[PDB]
Amino acid sequence: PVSEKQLAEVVANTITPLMKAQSVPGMAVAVIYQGKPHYYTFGKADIAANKPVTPQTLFELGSISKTFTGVLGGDAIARGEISLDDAVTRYWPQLTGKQWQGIRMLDLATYTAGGLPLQVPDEVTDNASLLRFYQNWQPQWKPGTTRLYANASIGLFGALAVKPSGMPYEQAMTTRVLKPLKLDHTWINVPKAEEAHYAWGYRDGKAVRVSPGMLDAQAYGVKTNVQDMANWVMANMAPENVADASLKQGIALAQSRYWRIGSMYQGLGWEMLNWPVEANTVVEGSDSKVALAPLPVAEVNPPAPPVKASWVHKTGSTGGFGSYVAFIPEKQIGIVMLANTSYPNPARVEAAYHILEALQ
Numbered sequence: 599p600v601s602e603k604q605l606a607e608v609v610a611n612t613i614t615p616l617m618k619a620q621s622v623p624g625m626a627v628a629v630i631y632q633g634k635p636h637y638y639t640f641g642k643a644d645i646a647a648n649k650p651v652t653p654q655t656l657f658e659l660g661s662i663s664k665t666f667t668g669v670l671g672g673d674a675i676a677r678g679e680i681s682l683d684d685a686v687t688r689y690w691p692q693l694t695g696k697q698w699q700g701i702r703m704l705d706l707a708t709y710t711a712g713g714l715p716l717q718v719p720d721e722v723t724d725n726a727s728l729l730r731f732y733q734n735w736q737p738q739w740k741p742g743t744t745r746l747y748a749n750a751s752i753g754l755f756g757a758l759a760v761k762p763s764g765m766p767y768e769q770a771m772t773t774r775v776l777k778p779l780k781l782d783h784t785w786i787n788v789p790k791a792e793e794a795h796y797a798w799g800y801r802d803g804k805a806v807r808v809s810p811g812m813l814d815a816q817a818y819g820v821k822t823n824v825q826d827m828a829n830w831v832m833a834n835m836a837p838e839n840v841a842d843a844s845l846k847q848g849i850a851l852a853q854s855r856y857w858r859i860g861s862m863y864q865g866l867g868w869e870m871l872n873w874p875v876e877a878n879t880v881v882e883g884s885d886s887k888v889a890l891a892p893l894p895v896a897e898v899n900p901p902a903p904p905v906k907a908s909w910v911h912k913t914g915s916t917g918g919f920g921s922y923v924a925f926i927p928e929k930q931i932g933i934v935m936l937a938n939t940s941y942p943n944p945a946r947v948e949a950a951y952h953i954l955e956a957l958q
């Protein structure tokens with residue numbers, strides 16, 4: 599029973615103090631409710647140029663990029679091109695180190711290979727050095743025992759998942775995920791002609807944007823505006839309405855539960871908790887001392903298909919940007935919060951939960 603006016607008030611009353619407390623120059627917010635997105639913009643995209651945030655402003659998604667990676671992988675599974683149960687080495691035969699035996703594509707996709715680190719080392723600058731890195735990696739755990747959140751893990755899953763397609767990652771993503779969903783302002787590389795829409799990120803007063811790195815597209819490199827992001831959330835909320843038959847299955851695969859780690863479940867990029875969930879559960883789970891820790895897992899085998907009564911979410915950050923998306927399929931409500939400052943994840947989660955609580 600929530601009016602447009604009431605929703606607009608709860609968003610303003612939550613976001614205005616958040617931006618003040620967290621020194622955030624600009625935010626674009628979408629709330630999905632009653633089958634439609636509702637857009638709210640605040641502050642500046644570029645302080646020096648005095649450019650306001652608009653619904654066309656592009657923000658760096660950081661790790662929300664992993665949700666695209668997960669869905670693209672799922673789409674490849676649904677085409678018959680890959681299986682999560684396949685050995686990693688099926689897709690990279692040059693990866694001959696015997697520590698790789700028993701490590702599945704599932705493990706790469708869900709951070710359970712056995713201690714792959716948060717980042718691909720900066721000294722890795724091409725495929726040969728990327729191979730050397732993986733060949734020299736000494737797993738700290740057996741496969742399927744420990745979750746360690748890692749770009750070096752899901753980044754490689756993304757790269758290998760598109761090999762059978764024959765397309766480079768960017769083209770596979772655009773052809774198979776972005777274009778079918780009409781996400782026409784979502785970019786791995788922002789064309790010169792669209793650069794005027796690209797916000798500056800801000801860190802400690804300084805303007806910054808994300809730098810190139812190995813496996814950046816697959817782990818943290820996507821830029822988008824709040825409209826394309828609202829439409830991404832809507833496709834993930836209600837995949838039954840997506841026309842492309844492999845893509846709708848890929849969305850389901852990305853929201854399936856593969857592992858339980860405490861009160862959360864790992865999907866492909868997406869993370870889930872059972873709905874109903876209290877704020878403290880989700881807020882506390884997002885603290886870096888939990889989220890970046892190596893933690894034991896319980897296998898969900900076979901994987902559980904998408905549970906509609908879920909809090910489905912993902913944080914994403916770069917040096918200058920902080921974003922969050924969350925949705926509850928049972929209730930068909932969801933939220934996107936894009937900001938040009940990286941501020942603490944628990945603050946993102948608290949604000950999002952508060953706003954969605956208003957819609958029941």
Ligand SMILES: *[B@@]1([O])O[C]([C]C([O])=O)[C][C][C]1[N]C(=O)[C]C1=[C][C]=[C]S1
Pocket residue numbers: 659660661662749808818913914915916917943
């Ligand atoms: B990704 O955003 O996920 C984690 C942080 C989070 O929960 O948002 C770890 C960092 C990931 N992002 C990147 O690796 C991209 C960055 C570039 C510079 C700082 S983060």
